[PDB]
Symmetry: C2
């Protein structure tokens, strides 16, 4: 099954089997995917706007150039997964297991990552500004090139994280050091 | 009173009034300055090696190109004071009040600064390597150009301290960040 160049709104998909579906430039607006099986699905240029993925399974899926704007992923089985240049603006990933997930070059503005596990995640050249990272585990994550709020450095658990020069300067300043030069 | 080009070893100066004395290239070795008034004194190129200044007063003194090697400053009234390019190697300054004191370009290698107060101190281009800074207060100190051990950044209280780029990178690394 392949869905292409079309739009679905307010649809109830609860506990449906959508395993191995392909979408190309499909828009899902306010759809309920609670408990749905999306195992091994594949999405190219598609959009999931304010959709609910509570207790759904999206593992083994591939999303390229997709939007997840405002969608909710509480207790979603995500990993392993492939995200290529995706937009997660305002998505809720609180408490999600994202260990060793690659979100390089992804937009993660104002995302909720409260209590999210991102240990050893690859977050290179991402944008995390406005994100809520209370109790987020970023130990040994690769953050190089990623834009973060100063508050990120005093909120997220970043021991062992790989950072660049600009991030190191920002880390010191966020801890109240007056950095000169 | 002006002493010059003299060496004093194992001298008891306890509770003597040495206020406004001047010394030029005088060596004091294992001299006891406990409870001495050394207020408003002046020292150029003098050495105080393994001397005790316990409970002494040295405030409003000037020390230029002086060595304090291994000397003990416990409960000494130090500040305010002028130190110019002095060497404090292995001195004991535990619990001492050095607030807003200028120790720029001073050697402070393997000094004890345990519980020392250096808030707003000026420590530009100093060397603090090997120093014990457990419970040391460096809030709003100027540390720019100063050499410190990595452990300094996780031991001394440095909120508000002025630091340079290299120090900021070292601060991050000392907190477990992998800086690339």
């Amino acid at each position: 099954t392949v869905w292409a160049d079309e739009e679905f709104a307010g649809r109830d998909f609860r506990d449906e089997d959508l395993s191995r579906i392909r979408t190309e430039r499909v828009v899902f607006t306010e759809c309920d995917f609670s408990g749905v099986d999306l195992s091994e699905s594949e999405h190219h240029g598609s959009a999931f706007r304010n959709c609910t993925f509570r207790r759904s399974t999206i593992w083994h899926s591939t999303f390229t150039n997709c939007s997840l704007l405002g969608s909710v992923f509480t207790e979603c089985r995500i990993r392993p997964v492939t995200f290529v240049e995706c937009d997660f603006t305002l998505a809720v990933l609180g408490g999600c297991d994202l260990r060793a997930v690659d979100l390089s070059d992804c937009r993660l503005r104002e995302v909720s990552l409260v209590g999210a596990d991102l240990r050893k995640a690859v977050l290179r050249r991402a944008d995390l500004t406005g994100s809520r990272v209370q109790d987020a585990r970023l130990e040994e994550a690769d953050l190089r090139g990623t834009r973060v709020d100063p508050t990120f450095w005093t909120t997220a658990k970043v021991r062992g994280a790989k950072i660049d020069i600009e991030q190191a300067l920002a880390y010191a300043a966020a801890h109240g050091l007056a950095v000169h030069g």
